[PDB]
Write a protein that binds this ligand. Structure first.
Ligand code: HEM
Ligand SMILES: O=C(CCCCn1ccnc1)N[C@@H](Cc1ccccc1)C(=O)O
Length: 455
């Protein structure tokens, strides 16, 4: 039985002030560098254990021993995502019911139906960049978020956010971002009922009311029109859980839509932003990915089958997820008493955090070159040890949107590589901005058209 280490404490605040920082995930990664594969993290009324080694995480991913926990962050997000799929406990009736209903909407097979709508938005991105003047540049995360937001809006419920027509965010997005910020900022308030925060609470409720009212009207409008657009909303309005025989109710449908829009916003655009960052920093890798794009994407717009054939582009995306997974942690609890790694006894109910970026830097798995960007690591999934690579979570609670995100990202990155040469014209210094997701803040490039038509 080993005692686990613990980072520095602040008296009765315990470790909580360590997360009173602009970049808490990177702070936790530095703590893991100092303390090793496991450390205890205490706050007032809270104890968790951060895991960073594949040795321990492979045990944490044993679904017979550990189930998904709502982290404090997810408990705060649940105030506006409700019992949608990502903020539900596994034992809540609406988790399994929504899971069974929505799985066919998110499969590779469903991607064939979404493909034309994804192409629609990808073409708008390419056309924007074709239309820039000589020495203008691209604001990468900003344009990637325009693309991913528009793609989930259109595939999700046939709604055009028209992000490439505007600078100012959509009213839904304004309230979503401000609610997420309040949820993230609240992971520090010792006296949340202090009259000091009444304005934060008032604003938080107005933002929740904005999201609910707007989504509820999208649902009511679709029901009033009878239109059967083949999108996630139609699937939720018509689908029935094979187990209970029941459909989702309108309240839970709204929670799912809010959940999908958040997932498809900066969490997914972050992947594209980091991938393009690593490509311009590794010109030989960019060259190889651009050679694949040219060879495969032989038609004016890509087909579904062509996207599946962008194997090296897919490897680029997985290697970007290895280094900077954009949903950087998930939480587990012990279903029963158990011992972790032969060394750390856990009681039923004890909580674990999986620190994904640090897992993905385990040199016993990847070798000494863990910081290098080498997509070839992903040539063969059977050569990767179990539970070494977890950017989409674990088990039945893994990301339902994984195929959607990777199809979207592979399509757009392929088209980017086909149509432009890229310049890191500022020699950009990576600065990772943290919300509940991760983003290369201020990442800019110049894109020179190869003058290949879309017609
Ligand atoms: C690269 C992009 C994405 C990444 C890295 C990602 C990552 C993750 C991770 C790590 C989890 C597990 C969370 C936990 O255990 O607490 C998760 C769950 C989930 N994600 Fe994603 N996600 C991505 C894109 C998406 C998209 C595009 C959608 C939907 C449009 C989506 C919808 C969901 C849902 C509904 C869940 C909860 C699944 C369940 O518990 O049944 N995600 N995602
Ligand atoms: O350490 C994370 C990382 C957040 C990851 C969120 N996220 C969302 C999607 N992907 C990842 N959270 C913890 C933070 C914490 C720990 C102890 C005490 C108070 C607060 C938590 O929330 O309790």
């Amino acid at each position: 039985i080993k005692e686990m280490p613990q980072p520095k404490t602040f008296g009765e605040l315990k470790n909580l002030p360590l997360l009173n920082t602009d970049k808490p995930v990177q702070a936790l990664m530095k703590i893991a560098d100092e303390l090793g594969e496991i450390f205890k993290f205490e706050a007032p009324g809270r104890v968790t254990r951060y895991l960073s080694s594949q040795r321990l995480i492979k045990e944490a991913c044993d679904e017979s021993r550990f189930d998904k926990n709502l982290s404090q962050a997810l408990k705060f997000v649940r105030d506006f995502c409700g019992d949608g799929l990502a903020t539900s406990w596994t034992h809540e009736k609406n988790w399994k019911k929504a899971h069974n209903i929505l799985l066919p909407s998110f499969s590779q097979q469903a991607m064939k139906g979404y493909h034309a709508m994804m192409v629609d938005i990808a073409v708008q991105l390419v056309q924007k960049w074709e239309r820039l003047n000589a020495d203008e540049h691209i604001e990468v995360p900003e344009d990637m978020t325009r693309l991913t937001l528009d793609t989930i809006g259109l595939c999700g419920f046939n709604y055009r956010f028209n992000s490439f027509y505007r600078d100012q965010p959509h009213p839904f997005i304004t309230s979503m971002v401000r609610a997420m910020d309040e949820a993230m900022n609240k992971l520090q308030r010792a006296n949340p009922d202090d009259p000091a925060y009444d304005e934060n609470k008032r604003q938080f409720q107005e933002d929740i009311k904005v999201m609910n009212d707007l989504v509820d009207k999208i649902i009511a409008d679709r029901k009033a029109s009878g239109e059967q657009s083949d999108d996630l909303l139609t699937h939720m309005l018509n689908g029935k859980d094979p187990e209970t025989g029941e459909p989702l109710d309108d309240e839970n449908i709204r929670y799912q839509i809010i959940t999908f829009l958040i997932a498809g916003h900066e969490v997914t655009s972050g992947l594209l932003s980091f991938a393009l960052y690593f490509l311009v920093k590794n010109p030989h890798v960019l060259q190889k990915a651009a050679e694949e794009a040219a060879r495969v994407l032989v038609d004016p717009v890509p087909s579904y089958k062509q996207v599946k054939q962008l194997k090296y582009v897919g490897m680029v995306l997985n290697e970007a997820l290895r280094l900077w997974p954009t949903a950087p942690a998930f939480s587990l609890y012990a279903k029963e008493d158990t011992v972790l790694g032969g060394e750390y006894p856990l009681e039923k109910g004890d909580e674990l955090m999986v620190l994904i970026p640090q897992l993905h830097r385990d040199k016993t798995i990847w070798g000494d070159d863990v910081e290098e960007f080498r997509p070839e690591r992903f040539e063969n999934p059977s050569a990767i040890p179990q539970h070494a690579f977890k950017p989409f979570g674990n088990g039945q609670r893994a990301c339902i949107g994984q195929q959607f995100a990777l199809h979207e990202a592979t399509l757009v990155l392929g088209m980017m590589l086909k149509h432009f040469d890229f310049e890191d014209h500022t020699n950009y210094e990576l600065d990772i901005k943290e919300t509940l997701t991760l983003k290369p803040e201020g990442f800019v490039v110049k894109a020179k058209s190869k003058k290949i038509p879309l017609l």
